[PDB]
Design a protein around this ligand. Structure first.
Ligand code: 92K
Ligand code: 92K
Ligand code: MN
Ligand code: MN
Lengths: 255, 255
């Protein structure tokens, strides 16, 4: 069966697993919004005990964060457009959605030349002419190697806001309506471009994806280790009651 | 090759995904220790905004918990015996450890008759005469249907402590030394019996497993939906810096 052969492949090294997740720690940046809005929290952790009088033979921590901290998954209820879609929270999404085919569109050269680099319908058509049509219900990842930027360069906040690559409304509408993708993922802090508030509609990845009951992934790492096609993405969010998303361990299995 | 067949199976339903995770919520019980010690925290969440003046077009929460809250994963560094094993924290465990073969030993009839039901080497031997030798580097799950218990029955706290099924020290030692398992999982709050403090060594699942650089899973649900052999477990914990474990979405793929 396919499961027995996956086990054999993982055992022999014919199938490798790539970790697409940033480490959770207090220093990792989270999305920054205008100061009048409630803000996403950074990851924090505190010891309960560390093999001491509070717990002599064990070590463990309390942790705090937001649903949208670090490498994380966005459910449709995250956006106003996904308010009434079925199974809109992370605890309600059907489990078969958490494992599936993934395609990677390499936009890293574009991002290196332009902070606001745009994934367009034209780029998608060019990619498909080379790698074949995007299969239905696939995860689509926009590779930018943005995960290599550290410090203030990662959010890349300027006076007129953050500047980081992302999809145009037309690119997202195409993926949803013409390809019925499962979800869209980025190496940036958001599924939308840094300047994405200024598209029509505002935050089109969030508005259109979540309005269609589709999912988002953000702050992905190591996309440069993945093939354009043929890998399998594992992205199972925490089963948070009525959760709009959660941090998660994103993995890719590759041949 | 094998991944293409997995994709095909997942798409067609020839491969099904079983969700083994309890919902993360304030009311799900966590392990309780003697009062002089630091205690595991319950899951908590608060709204940042809900499509309102705090965040007009979006909804999201801040969340807090322990590494060992709910359906969760225990890394070797959790126990004093595994403090110094290489790759001992959840952020260091090789990603290939997160996907692999799983066997399910059905102890539900026993658990229904005895709150303190013990998984023994003899029971494991009986399981193997029926289902074949436990494969090396496999996840072993102790099924008890304990997850069907709600209210105070789940912790099953009495005047002399909690009473819930678990493995004997000899069982764990056998699985480690004679079968070289990857890890051990249960539907109860701990990988150890409720009365596991009174074994030698105290809490032997933790002491022995984590001492051997092996992993734990706790509070699993729906084990009664899995085959004894043939399934693949997906158990990828959060990439917490120096983390001793984390809540996670545990899944099984079944043919
Ligand atoms: N929470 C948000 C609010 C406004 C704009 C964007 C976002 C995100 O990118 C997010 O989902 O983390
Ligand atoms: N953290 C503990 C401390 C003492 C005994 C048991 C435990 C656990 O079961 C656990 O790892 O969740
Ligand atoms: Mn998000
Ligand atoms: Mn634990």
């Amino acid at each position: 069966s396919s499961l027995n052969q996956l086990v054999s492949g993982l055992a022999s090294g014919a199938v490798r697993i790539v970790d697409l997740t940033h480490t959770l720690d207090p220093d990792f940046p989270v999305i920054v919004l205008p100061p009048e809005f409630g803000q996403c929290a950074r990851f924090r952790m505190e010891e309960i005990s560390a093999y001491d009088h509070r717990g002599p033979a064990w070590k463990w921590h309390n942790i705090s964060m937001s649903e949208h901290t670090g490498t994380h998954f966005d459910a449709p209820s995250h956006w106003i457009s996904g308010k009434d879609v079925p199974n809109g929270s992370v605890d309600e999404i059907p489990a078969e959605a958490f494992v599936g085919p993934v395609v990677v569109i390499d936009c890293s050269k574009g991002a290196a030349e332009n902070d606001d680099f745009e994934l367009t319908p034209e780029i998608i058509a060019g990619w498909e002419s080379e790698h074949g049509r995007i299969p239905e219900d696939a995860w689509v990842l926009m590779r930018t190697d943005w995960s290599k930027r550290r410090g203030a360069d990662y959010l890349n906040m300027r006076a007129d806001g953050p500047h980081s690559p992302g999809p145009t409304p037309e690119a997202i509408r195409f993926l949803i309506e013409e390809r019925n993708i499962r979800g869209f993922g980025t190496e940036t802090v958001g599924t939308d471009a840094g300047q994405g508030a200024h598209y029509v509609p505002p935050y089109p990845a969030h508005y259109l994806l979540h309005g269609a009951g589709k999912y988002g992934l953000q702050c992905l790492a190591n996309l440069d280790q993945l093939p354009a096609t043929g890998a399998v993405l594992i992205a199972a969010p925490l089963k948070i009651k009525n959760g709009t998303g959660s941090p998660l361990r994103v993995l890719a299995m590759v041949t």
